[PDB]
Structures are given as structure tokens and as C-alpha cells.
Design a protein around this nucleic acid. Sequence first.
DNA 1: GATTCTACGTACATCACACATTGTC
DNA 2: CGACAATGTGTGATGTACGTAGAAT
Lengths: 85, 125
Amino acid sequence: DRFLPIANVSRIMKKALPANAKISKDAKETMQECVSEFISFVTGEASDKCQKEKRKTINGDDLLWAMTTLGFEDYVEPLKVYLQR
Amino acid sequence: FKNHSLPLARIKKIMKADEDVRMISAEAPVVFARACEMFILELTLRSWNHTEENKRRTLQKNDIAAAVTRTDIFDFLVDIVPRMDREARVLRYREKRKTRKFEKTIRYASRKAYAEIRPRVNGRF
DNA sequence: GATTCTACGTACATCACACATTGTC
DNA sequence: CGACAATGTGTGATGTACGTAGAAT
């Protein structure tokens, strides 16, 4: 319950790799731990900004400002497009 | 279209581990879904470069560890892999990592009471 | 050791709606 | 400023999609 489901993480990893490729199980476990820790990293930064801006609800723009502050800049712009709902 | 890959409820649980989090918009789990997906993609490719550098067809943990240690955007991971402000924030992140609560915590017990009272069909409202 | 495959068994998604939240006045 | 109004999100119970656990290839 402390990490993301492993089947979905592993399938996402497969989508990035050729069909002939293989993935160690230890690598799958490490990858799922890494993504859960990345989530908590960005969430802590977004919460820092929301406290600094006297807000209590966490929104997408807060997440993206956090991710930009954390160096994942090249992630932001398509995620901005994904936001439109 | 909007039937997502990974579960949103799990992202919410992982978020709620931070005690400085009160309300989570519906936008945030949907954003994090694709954010994590793209993160997986980048990290897997960065590690696959090293796997190819060892002429191997299998991705093992040491490949990911090398990929982590090569690039600074994943410096926060150095504590989890076997190996001027942003770095201080990374250490703040490490300190917050120790203080994580995954226990079911109620924040707006009024909403809880109303939910105990609301009319529910098949458990649904 | 790592993938497919099947059948369990779990945890995700879903609901309505009183007030917390927001930024605007 | 701090109140108005409008927009929006926390909260439990449950069926059922879906991830999990093992052998077998």
C-alpha cells in the first residue's frame, strides 16, 4: 500500500523498451519505489508552495510549479496540455 | 480517453502521507498519472543506455542505480539506490520522508459524520 | 531467473451534497 | 481588509475490474 501497483509500473517500463528486451524483477521493484518517492517529493514541494501562498487545496499548477522548481522542466509543457479538461 | 493507466486512489494515498496536505483537487491525481508515466519513461531509457553499455538485454537494479547517479535531476534518489537552494530542499524532502503517515486519518470529521448519515444504495451515495 | 497463463481475492472507482476553499469585491 | 458567492472536494460501503501469487513453459 506504500507504493504504486507493480503490474502497471512494469507495463509502463515495457512500453519504453523493445520487444526483445527483458526486465529484472529487482529493477521493477526499484522502479516502483522510485516513482512513489518522486510522487512524495513533488507533493512536498507543492505543499510548501501552497503553505507559502496561504492555500489549503493543492492544484495542478502548484504541482507543475513544484516540478519546474525540481528540474523536471521538460515534463511541464505537455502536462500543461494534458490539464485542459 | 480518461480511463487512466495507473490508479488515482493510490496517488492520493501516497500524497496523503504528507501531513501538510489537507485537500487534493481532482486535477492532481490525473496530472501525477502522466507525470509518473513520463518519469518512468525517462528513467528507463537512461538506465537502458547503461544496459546497452554492458551488452545486456535485461534491465537490472544496478542499471537504474547508475542512471540515478549520473543525472542530478534524480539526486533525491541517491538515498534509495545502492550507488544552492534545491539541494537544501532535497534534504528537507529526506527529513519529510521519515515522517509519513499511511494510517487512515480524518481531517474534516464533519464530512465523516454526514457520510455516516447520508443515504447509501449498494454502498454508493 | 524472467515471462505467459489461469483463478482467486484485493483494493480501485463510484456515488450526493453540506460546507471548506478561493479570489474577488 | 475579511465578507459574498460560486466553485469544488472530503467522507464510508460495496460490487467488480484488476492486480497478485504461484506453478509451468
